[PDB]
Design a protein around this motif. Structure first.
Motif, short mmCIF file in Angstrom:
data_model
loop_
_atom_site.label_atom_id
_atom_site.label_comp_id
_atom_site.label_asym_id
_atom_site.label_seq_id
_atom_site.Cartn_x
_atom_site.Cartn_y
_atom_site.Cartn_z
N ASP G 15 -55.56 5.54 28.97
CA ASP G 15 -54.51 4.60 28.64
C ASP G 15 -54.65 4.07 27.22
O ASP G 15 -55.71 4.18 26.60
CB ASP G 15 -54.49 3.44 29.64
CG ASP G 15 -55.87 2.92 29.94
OD1 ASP G 15 -56.85 3.59 29.57
OD2 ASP G 15 -55.98 1.84 30.54
N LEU G 17 -54.94 1.47 24.05
CA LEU G 17 -55.95 0.45 23.85
C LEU G 17 -55.52 -0.70 22.95
O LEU G 17 -56.18 -1.74 22.97
CB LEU G 17 -57.23 1.08 23.28
CG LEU G 17 -57.94 2.08 24.20
CD1 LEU G 17 -58.94 2.90 23.44
CD2 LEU G 17 -58.61 1.38 25.35
N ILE G 18 -54.47 -0.55 22.17
CA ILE G 18 -53.86 -1.65 21.43
C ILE G 18 -52.82 -2.30 22.33
O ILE G 18 -52.18 -1.62 23.14
CB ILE G 18 -53.23 -1.15 20.12
CG1 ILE G 18 -54.25 -0.37 19.30
CG2 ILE G 18 -52.71 -2.29 19.29
CD1 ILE G 18 -53.72 0.12 17.99
N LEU G 51 -44.62 6.76 19.11
CA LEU G 51 -45.29 6.50 17.85
C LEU G 51 -46.67 5.88 18.04
O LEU G 51 -47.53 6.03 17.18
CB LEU G 51 -44.42 5.59 16.98
CG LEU G 51 -44.83 5.32 15.54
CD1 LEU G 51 -44.99 6.61 14.77
CD2 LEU G 51 -43.79 4.46 14.89
N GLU G 53 -48.73 6.59 20.69
CA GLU G 53 -49.64 7.62 21.17
C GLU G 53 -50.21 8.43 20.02
O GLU G 53 -51.40 8.76 20.02
CB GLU G 53 -48.92 8.54 22.16
CG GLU G 53 -48.61 7.89 23.48
CD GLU G 53 -49.62 8.24 24.55
OE1 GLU G 53 -50.70 8.77 24.20
OE2 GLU G 53 -49.35 7.99 25.74
N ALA G 54 -49.38 8.77 19.04
CA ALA G 54 -49.83 9.54 17.90
C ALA G 54 -50.67 8.72 16.93
O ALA G 54 -51.48 9.28 16.19
CB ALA G 54 -48.63 10.14 17.17
N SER G 55 -50.51 7.39 16.94
CA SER G 55 -51.30 6.55 16.04
C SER G 55 -52.74 6.45 16.50
O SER G 55 -53.66 6.45 15.68
CB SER G 55 -50.68 5.17 15.95
OG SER G 55 -49.55 5.17 15.10
N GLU G 56 -52.96 6.34 17.81
CA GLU G 56 -54.31 6.20 18.33
C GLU G 56 -55.04 7.52 18.47
O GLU G 56 -56.27 7.54 18.47
CB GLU G 56 -54.28 5.49 19.68
CG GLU G 56 -53.85 4.05 19.59
CD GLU G 56 -53.90 3.36 20.93
OE1 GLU G 56 -54.65 3.82 21.81
OE2 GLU G 56 -53.18 2.36 21.10
N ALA G 57 -54.31 8.63 18.60
CA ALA G 57 -54.96 9.93 18.55
C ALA G 57 -55.42 10.26 17.15
O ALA G 57 -56.33 11.08 16.98
CB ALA G 57 -54.01 11.01 19.06
N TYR G 58 -54.83 9.64 16.14
CA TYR G 58 -55.22 9.85 14.75
C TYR G 58 -56.42 8.98 14.38
O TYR G 58 -57.30 9.42 13.64
CB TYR G 58 -54.03 9.55 13.84
CG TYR G 58 -54.37 9.37 12.39
CD1 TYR G 58 -54.54 10.46 11.56
CD2 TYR G 58 -54.51 8.11 11.85
CE1 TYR G 58 -54.85 10.30 10.24
CE2 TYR G 58 -54.83 7.94 10.54
CZ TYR G 58 -54.99 9.04 9.74
OH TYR G 58 -55.31 8.87 8.41
N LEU G 59 -56.47 7.75 14.90
CA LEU G 59 -57.57 6.85 14.57
C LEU G 59 -58.84 7.24 15.31
O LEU G 59 -59.94 7.12 14.76
CB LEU G 59 -57.18 5.42 14.89
CG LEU G 59 -56.18 4.71 13.98
CD1 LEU G 59 -55.96 3.29 14.44
CD2 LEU G 59 -56.64 4.74 12.54
N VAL G 60 -58.72 7.68 16.56
CA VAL G 60 -59.88 8.12 17.31
C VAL G 60 -60.49 9.36 16.69
O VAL G 60 -61.71 9.52 16.64
CB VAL G 60 -59.51 8.35 18.79
CG1 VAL G 60 -60.54 9.20 19.48
CG2 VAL G 60 -59.38 7.04 19.50
N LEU G 62 -60.34 10.21 13.47
CA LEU G 62 -60.95 9.86 12.19
C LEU G 62 -62.24 9.08 12.37
O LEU G 62 -63.13 9.16 11.53
CB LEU G 62 -59.96 9.07 11.35
CG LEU G 62 -60.48 8.40 10.07
CD1 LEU G 62 -60.66 9.41 8.97
CD2 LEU G 62 -59.55 7.31 9.63
N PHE H 38 -50.64 5.23 7.43
CA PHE H 38 -50.16 6.28 8.32
C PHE H 38 -48.77 5.94 8.87
O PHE H 38 -47.92 6.82 8.99
CB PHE H 38 -51.17 6.48 9.45
CG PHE H 38 -50.72 7.43 10.52
CD1 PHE H 38 -50.87 8.79 10.35
CD2 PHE H 38 -50.20 6.97 11.71
CE1 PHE H 38 -50.48 9.66 11.34
CE2 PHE H 38 -49.80 7.83 12.69
CZ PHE H 38 -49.95 9.18 12.51
N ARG H 72 -48.58 17.51 12.65
CA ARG H 72 -49.11 16.82 13.81
C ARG H 72 -48.09 16.94 14.93
O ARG H 72 -47.26 16.05 15.12
CB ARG H 72 -49.43 15.37 13.49
CG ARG H 72 -50.16 15.17 12.19
CD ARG H 72 -50.93 13.87 12.19
NE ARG H 72 -51.84 13.78 13.32
CZ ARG H 72 -53.15 13.97 13.25
NH1 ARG H 72 -53.71 14.27 12.08
NH2 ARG H 72 -53.91 13.87 14.33
#
Lengths: 97, 97, 96, 79, 92, 99, 93, 79
Positions: G15, G17-18, G51, G53-60, G62, H38, H72
């Motif tokens: 799930d 996390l923000i 938007l 879902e793709a933000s947290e897949a990018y931060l995890v 990195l 981003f 992406r």
DNA sequence: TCTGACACGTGCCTGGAGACTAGGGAGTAATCCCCTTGGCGGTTAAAACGCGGGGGACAGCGCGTACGTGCGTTTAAGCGGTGCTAGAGCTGTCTACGACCAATTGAGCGGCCTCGGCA
DNA sequence: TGCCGAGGCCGCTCAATTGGTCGTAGACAGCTCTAGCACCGCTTAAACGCACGTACGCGCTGTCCCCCGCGTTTTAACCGCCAAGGGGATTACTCCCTAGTCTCCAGGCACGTGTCAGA
């Protein structure tokens, strides 16, 4: 000609044929070839003015592939557009960490 | 001074644009890798300008990877690049590994 | 017995150069590089204009499609000047 | 023994153009393995372009299409 | 009306394992997969016909593109699956 | 009858034929091109479905959820580099602790 | 070590996390600097979910590369110089 | 600020999913700047798609096309 | 325990299949001459080899600051209602704009010379 | 020192211009109802903050080893010149296969009705 009609140097009529035979759409608008030809000539004239300065610092007369590499890597907008491209016989930028 | 000799050599090869691997041994290695993708009595030839295009792109790839390897050695506070720097670099940029 | 004719942009790249600085030259290896640059940007803008029309259920690529693809592909200040040169041509073309 | 034609003094000159000051003895065999891997990935795709055209000679355009296929465009040999 | 592949994906699952189910967001993810691979193959067969100056995309083009796009032993099992289907279609 | 039962297939051959003729790919389409491309798409779909259903029957589950698809793609070598630039919604990551 | 108990916990769940209401207030703020005052925009409810879902897949992703660069330097604490070097070797964004 | 609603306890859970054990105090502000850069890269391209269609609402498909534009690809939202 | 989402059933309609006619793209020959491959010897640029010495990598050390844990106070997120109105999605008309065709002739290319910036 | 590569002439031809005609894609205006935005009040999950202790980052010093630099010897790259021949590249010739078009009807979608797999 159709290039003189729009105040351009690149060929408008040749670009019109390449758009019709490239399998992009079924129909092509009347102003589409004129818009795209003016953008191509602007980008060519821009990359050509930076590579001429590079040659005119070394007191050189003719532009060589090394001069094209220096102009692109030294410019912020051109470096990001051409960030996945290799120039043949270009070299690198001098840098010692 | 042995340290100012390496600085003299980094300056020298960052100004040149030549190919640094010899040409006759490089062309032999390319014709040997080819024999592994062909069957019996189906050998292929190479144009002389295709071997030169494949060498310009291989050295541009090797110089770009040895520079990320140098950045990972200064992060661990060494000046000598190790085999373990090259491995971590190939993993961070996920192209081949 | 004749050969096939190859089309390039060399005739025109050489005119845009002799226009501002008439004493500078260019070598045959540099002219080959500049043809690959013009053919690469052409295909990038034409391939993006072809998706914009399919996403909206049209069958025509117009000057409105070309302009939107130029804003998606070029970065920053490069795309602001490419929109001004391109609309000044369509204005000057269709005033005749 | 054709990978051994990539000599050690020629790997040092490539590391100079990247700004390196010292090299470990175990680097030279690792660099040869990375060139062999990269060459197989590109030549495999370029022989597929050659046999589709029913030719017996790899041309300069086959190598350019194989490199663009993997996100490495190259200007200066045809487009 | 909206077209998907949901009708057929659900028939393939029940041919092998007929007591497994599937959720609505999983089925939405498998729709994105089928027409993502369709887009990649049809776009590469289109360049192959232009590089060689042909006007047609044939089964010979579809075959060459699957070898470029799919990784090694995945591509060998797909070239035999599609060849077997054209031999059987052409006996009718 | 249907051009799919002639070829021994399940995915629809006549619909893939129309999607090729109306997608701006070439001026002409060969007769055997839609049969070859329909058979490859069904082979690839039935490979994911098998790996994902195998993961779901480890947890004694009876339904495939997005977490099971993520676990099957990242555990297969070839299927992992085909989908190496893809994000699965509500998938997660592989459990991995570094020594 | 409950630092290992929580790596196992949060690598098992799927799930977001923000929190959801603060994230949508920031997406509507960033939009206001690409439009004029006159014609403001609205957001569909499933477009903000897509938007995030793709933000947290990018931060995890990195933060995984940042952790690999802390163990190369014989540390277990990630630092600001570790995240900066990870973006040079990536060359994106 | 609205960037301050991305709280420190939440950043710390995202690092537990990545495998981190210990975190320096200066990481929390550096992660907030990476998220904002981003979001501006993607929203810029998604508002361009919206206005070419002459709409006033950002739809779920505009976000998918803007993400695929930058390498992406996202599955599961109707792409 | 509970029930919401998966799975099964009508009910219409639009998109696939069948049969034909027609014209150009593709497959097949045959010919010509460019350029890839292989051999030869000279000459010499450059790789290979070994030895010695000293700078840098690596391990151990001690200190001190900053990260993490707990514990209580304080904030605003989540859930549910209700109301309001903007604008997404659909439909029916109508005319301007782009494909199609043909008959012209000039732009742009290939094959030449002329010789002058880079070495 | 020439000097190989830019750089202006120059026949010849195929591709860009022009002027019509034909049908359809795109622009425009009106209407129906979904879904996005703002509010309210309660409840309590979770963020906040503040003192404490200690483990970890970090700087300093020492020891060996393994990279670098030098000089002699040895290898094979590079160059010019040769002959031979496979195959790329163009050219006629034809006939098969695909687009275009109509008549007919079953596959696949949407609105419902269930009731059992996951908290």
């Amino acid at each position: 000609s159709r290039s003189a009609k729009a105040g351009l140097t690149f060929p408008v009529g040749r670009v019109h044929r390449l758009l019709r035979k490239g399998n992009y759409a079924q129909r092509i608008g009347s102003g589409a070839p004129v818009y795209l030809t003016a953008v191509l000539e602007y980008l060519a004239a821009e990359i050509l003015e930076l590579a001429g300065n590079a040659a005119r610092d070394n007191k050189k007369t003719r532009i060589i592939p090394r001069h094209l590499q220096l102009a692109i890597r030294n410019d912020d907008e051109l470096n990001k557009l051409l960030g996945n491209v290799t120039i043949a016989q270009g070299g690198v930028l001098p840098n010692i960490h | 001074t042995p340290s100012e000799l390496a600085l003299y050599e980094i300056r020298k090869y960052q100004r040149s644009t030549d190919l640094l691997i010899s040409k006759i041994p490089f062309a032999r290695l390319v014709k040997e890798v080819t024999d592994e993708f062909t069957t019996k009595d189906q050998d292929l030839r190479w144009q002389s300008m295709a071997i030169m295009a494949l060498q310009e792109a291989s050295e541009a790839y090797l110089v770009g990877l040895l520079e990320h390897t140098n950045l990972l050695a200064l992060h661990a506070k060494r000046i000598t690049i190790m085999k373990k720097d090259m491995q971590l670099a190939r993993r961070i940029r996920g192209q081949f590994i | 017995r004749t050969k096939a004719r190859k089309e390039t942009y060399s005739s025109y790249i050489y005119k845009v150069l002799k226009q501002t600085h008439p004493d500078t030259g260019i070598s045959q290896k540099s002219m080959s590089i500049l043809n690959s640059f013009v053919n690469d940007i052409f295909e990038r803008i034409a391939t993006e204009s072809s998706k914009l029309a399919a996403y909206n259920k049209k069958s025509t690529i117009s000057a409105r499609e070309i302009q939107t693809a130029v804003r998606l592909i070029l970065p920053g200040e490069l795309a602001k000047h490419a929109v001004s040169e391109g609309t000044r041509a369509v204005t000057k073309y269709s005033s005749s | 023994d054709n990978i051994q034609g990539i000599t050690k003094p020629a790997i040092r000159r490539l590391a100079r153009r990247g700004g390196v000051k010292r090299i470990s003895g175990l680097i030279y065999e690792e660099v040869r393995n990375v060139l062999k891997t990269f060459l197989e990935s590109v030549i495999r795709d370029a022989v597929t372009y050659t046999e589709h055209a029913k030719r017996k000679t790899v041309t300069s355009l086959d190598v350019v299409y194989a490199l663009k296929r993997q996100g490495r465009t190259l200007y200066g040999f045809g487009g």
